[PDB]
Amino acid sequence: MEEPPLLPGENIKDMAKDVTYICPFTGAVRGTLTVTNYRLYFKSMERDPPFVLDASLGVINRVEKIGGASSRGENSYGLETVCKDIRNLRFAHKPEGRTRRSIFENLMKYAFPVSNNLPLFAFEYKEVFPENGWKLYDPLLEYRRQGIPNESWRITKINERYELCDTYPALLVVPANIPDEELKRVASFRSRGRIPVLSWIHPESQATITRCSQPMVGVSGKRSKEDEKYLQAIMDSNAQSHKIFIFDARPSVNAVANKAKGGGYESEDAYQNAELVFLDIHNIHVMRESLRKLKEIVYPNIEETHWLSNLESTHWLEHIKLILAGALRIADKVESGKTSVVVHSSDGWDRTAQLTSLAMLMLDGYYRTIRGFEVLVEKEWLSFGHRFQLRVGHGDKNHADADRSPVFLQFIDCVWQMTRQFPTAFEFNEYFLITILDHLYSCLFGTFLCNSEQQRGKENLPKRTVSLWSYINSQLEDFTNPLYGSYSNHVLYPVASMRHLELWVGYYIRWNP
Ligand SMILES: CCCC(=O)OC[C@H](COP(=O)(O)O[C@@H]1[C@H](O)[C@H](OP(=O)(O)O)[C@@H](O)[C@H](O)[C@H]1O)OC(=O)CCC
């Protein structure tokens, strides 16, 4: 009865009878706690419908022991799982029941398989679907859709074996007149060899969106004649504007600080035909801290009296605002400015991925379809080396790792904001976005594992794991926006202000009924 449902490949690893779950909203409820290789399940027939708590082990970052027998209090002895999904779960065990240690140990083992030399559930998950999500994204075909390779832009195979840049995809689009040996020189000037490459091209103006990492200028004004020519080549392809725009996602202070560490930005002297703009979007450590502050004000209980000022102090929505405002500036420079833009950050993987993809969503209605959005994720995030496994910490017990940051979560939040402002512009619904966020942590699928395309290939995820798109695409009805259709040629111009943006209740505050 209180036994959990099981996915093909899932197994019960431990079970504790008469454990009390301390629900923050309804109160204590005694039932059975079960741990599988995929989830934590709690069910009690001591209510009606039975009470059911079902969470993927992947959302657990920590597990803490609460009390000892040296605790006389009612439900003072037990466990608490701190979760990535904007909650914490607290259970109470009876010392004489001798279940706490066992549950604690099995949780530490199965929620953090990587740390315990076990596989992530995605490799054990053996269900089969009608569609194969791994066949969804085809680089060459996406470029074709964009009218890519052409006269101005060619496809180079120089990174066919990730020699040029190992955090980059295999195929890269660069200016038709720039030879590979030259790409190699630009690569030594750009951080981690993440040179400027095409993300999107306007079908009418030929203004483009390129992306890259910061130029290694350093404390002395080191210049790269080839990088300068490369950017000039980017500009010479767009026959319109007599200038290019470089959007550095960082606040100026951080760009200057990077220069001090060896990196930097494109100066007015070195890049004569480029205008650089700082977008004031802070780093991963700042975003991690903003979410931490938000979780503490939304979960368990909100203090309504100071909601607005408490929300303000998190600076969550301010970050969302700066990210959307930056994407907006990029889209507008390309669309109404007919100007090409180069987008970067320090590393070019985090903020840069947020910026290109959001601008792209505004500009191209294709990315607003369910399949096109899946392509966008596979393209700008996965193939371009947003370090997913490190930013999420899949199956790793090191909860304090400073590499963990809600970068993709912020992106999805921004997508949801547009979805609110344009209720008929997207083919997918909110449920689709929340589902993506749940599986970002679940590790049921192989879609968000590994930190680069090269890694996913070496680990052969297409053949060893199931794609999230396989699940989603073979089951559309749930993720389709019924209002969709009344748009999708035109550019989206969301408004980025503290008065037009909201806190995504459906996601951050979904645990209270
Ligand atoms: C030096 C002592 C203090 C210290 O740790 O400074 C670190 C700074 C980090 O600079 P930041 O831009 O403030 O911070 C970086 C960005 O958040 C980057 O994202 P994105 O792709 O959006 O750029 C993350 O991937 C990096 O892990 C993070 O370090 O980097 C540098 O100074 C230059 C690196 C060559």
Side-chain angles (χ1 to χ4, degrees):
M1 290 232 74
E2 302 103 351
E3 203 154 279
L6 257 38
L7 295 176
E10 182 174 18
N11 308 127
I12 296 182
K13 301 300 186 177
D14 192 18
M15 175 277 286
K17 292 183 179 182
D18 291 329
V19 171
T20 298
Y21 169 60
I22 308 169
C23 180
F25 315 115
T26 63
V29 56
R30 194 183 90 186
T32 306
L33 182 61
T34 299
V35 177
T36 71
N37 53 325
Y38 175 69
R39 65 177 97 201
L40 177 174
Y41 189 88
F42 176 84
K43 182 169 181 177
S44 172
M45 296 302 282
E46 155 163 0
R47 281 184 185 201
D48 208 292
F51 177 99
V52 177
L53 184 58
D54 187 334
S56 303
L57 293 176
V59 299
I60 300 177
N61 46 210
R62 312 190 251 139
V63 182
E64 301 299 337
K65 298 184 178 181
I66 306 297
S70 186
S71 314
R72 293 165 177 142
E74 167 179 81
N75 299 302
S76 60
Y77 184 77
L79 297 178
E80 168 152 278
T81 59
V82 177
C83 307
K84 300 173 191 178
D85 64 350
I86 344 297
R87 63 183 163 162
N88 297 303
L89 302 180
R90 193 104 146 190
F91 302 86
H93 302 248
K94 277 275 157 181
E96 63 269 30
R98 295 102 67 242
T99 55
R100 187 180 84 165
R101 184 199 287 163
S102 180
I103 295 295
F104 175 76
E105 275 190 1
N106 276 290
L107 279 175
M108 291 304 304
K109 184 176 180 173
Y110 295 92
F112 309 113
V114 174
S115 291
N116 296 75
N117 185 218
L118 293 179
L120 292 179
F121 186 91
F123 298 90
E124 302 281 294
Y125 182 64
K126 47 148 107 176
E127 175 157 3
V128 184
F129 295 90
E131 308 294 355
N132 184 346
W134 297 112
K135 301 297 160 196
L136 189 281
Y137 177 55
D138 181 356
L140 191 70
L141 205 143
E142 160 63 12
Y143 289 137
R144 276 250 294 292
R145 183 188 72 74
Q146 289 191 43
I148 311 278
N150 74 13
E151 303 181 339
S152 303
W153 300 85
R154 77 193 182 75
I155 294 184
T156 180
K157 292 197 176 183
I158 188 177
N159 205 220
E160 265 214 304
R161 282 203 219 159
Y162 310 110
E163 264 156 283
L164 182 63
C165 173
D166 57 21
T167 52
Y168 268 32
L171 294 180
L172 302 172
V173 175
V174 304
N177 64 154
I178 301 295
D180 296 350
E181 174 64 84
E182 276 286 295
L183 294 180
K184 294 179 180 178
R185 299 226 139 172
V186 171
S188 57
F189 187 65
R190 291 288 168 169
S191 193
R192 301 170 184 281
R194 296 170 68 76
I195 64 170
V197 294
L198 187 68
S199 277
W200 193 82
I201 182 167
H202 193 287
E204 178 198 288
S205 66
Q206 311 289 90
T208 52
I209 304 155
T210 51
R211 55 174 296 172
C212 57
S213 58
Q214 67 185 142
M216 302 298 275
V217 173
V219 292
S220 6
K222 264 212 98 298
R223 295 184 55 185
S224 173
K225 294 76 260 297
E226 299 90 326
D227 187 279
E228 291 169 26
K229 209 281 107 179
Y230 194 82
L231 264 65
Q232 182 61 58
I234 292 176
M235 178 185 130
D236 294 323
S237 66
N238 178 7
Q240 218 79 30
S241 195
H242 310 108
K243 206 145 189 172
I244 52 170
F245 266 74
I246 302 173
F247 297 93
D248 172 356
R250 300 171 287 180
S252 58
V253 176
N254 301 93
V256 173
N258 268 254
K259 188 176 211 295
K261 277 210 67 177
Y265 60 93
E266 297 85 343
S267 70
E268 296 188 312
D269 288 336
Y271 300 77
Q272 279 291 8
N273 295 302
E275 272 179 32
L276 186 146
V277 168
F278 288 113
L279 297 176
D280 301 336
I281 301 166
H282 287 287
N283 74 18
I284 58 170
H285 310 299
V286 169
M287 310 309 196
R288 166 172 64 260
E289 174 66 4
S290 181
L291 185 58
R292 185 187 67 68
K293 295 184 150 179
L294 181 64
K295 181 179 176 181
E296 105 182 351
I297 62 173
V298 295
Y299 189 89
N301 304 302
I302 298 178
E303 202 300 286
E304 298 305 336
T305 285
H306 299 80
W307 169 242
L308 292 177
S309 55
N310 279 339
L311 170 61
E312 180 171 277
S313 71
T314 66
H315 299 130
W316 188 259
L317 280 186
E318 188 54 45
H319 294 306
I320 296 301
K321 198 254 293 180
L322 289 162
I323 293 160
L324 274 168
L328 259 181
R329 295 201 65 189
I330 291 166
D332 187 74
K333 182 54 59 183
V334 172
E335 185 48 42
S336 309
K338 315 292 184 169
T339 304
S340 290
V341 303
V342 178
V343 180
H344 87 235
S345 56
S346 296
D347 280 331
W349 53 35
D350 297 283
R351 293 169 284 206
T352 295
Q354 292 181 318
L355 294 168
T356 56
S357 62
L358 285 169
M360 291 173 63
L361 266 178
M362 297 177 192
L363 298 144
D364 194 333
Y366 169 70
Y367 299 132
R368 283 118 79 161
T369 60
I370 296 178
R371 289 173 61 76
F373 186 80
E374 293 172 350
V375 161
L376 186 66
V377 168
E378 290 292 338
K379 181 188 186 301
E380 294 298 316
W381 291 83
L382 299 164
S383 84
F384 273 98
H386 180 89
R387 307 184 301 183
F388 281 94
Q389 186 133 180
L390 182 86
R391 293 281 176 266
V392 173
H394 302 314
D396 186 318
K397 86 216 170 182
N398 295 139
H399 63 266
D401 187 354
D403 268 325
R404 302 205 183 178
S405 185
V407 177
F408 188 67
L409 167 63
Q410 289 182 318
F411 162 64
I412 295 301
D413 184 316
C414 290
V415 172
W416 177 74
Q417 301 290 338
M418 295 192 282
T419 241
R420 294 272 318 178
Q421 296 188 25
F422 300 102
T424 66
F426 303 82
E427 180 179 40
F428 54 77
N429 58 19
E430 185 189 21
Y431 185 70
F432 170 80
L433 297 179
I434 297 184
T435 295
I436 286 180
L437 293 175
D438 283 339
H439 288 302
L440 164 67
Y441 301 139
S442 71
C443 285
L444 177 59
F445 307 90
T447 295
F448 300 113
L449 305 177
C450 304
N451 292 299
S452 71
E453 185 176 85
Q454 180 187 45
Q455 295 193 338
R456 301 197 181 87
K458 293 188 177 182
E459 290 297 336
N460 215 0
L461 297 183
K463 285 274 171 178
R464 299 188 147 200
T465 61
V466 183
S467 173
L468 168 69
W469 313 137
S470 294
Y471 160 62
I472 294 187
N473 292 178
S474 287
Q475 213 163 178
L476 300 178
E477 162 180 18
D478 284 321
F479 317 90
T480 301
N481 168 11
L483 300 177
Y484 181 75
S486 2
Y487 237 98
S488 296
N489 197 194
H490 49 100
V491 176
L492 296 189
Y493 285 117
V495 181
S497 89
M498 207 53 48
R499 289 172 293 293
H500 298 74
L501 298 168
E502 296 161 36
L503 178 104
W504 189 18
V505 170
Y507 185 75
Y508 302 99
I509 316 156
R510 63 177 170 149
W511 305 126
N512 180 37

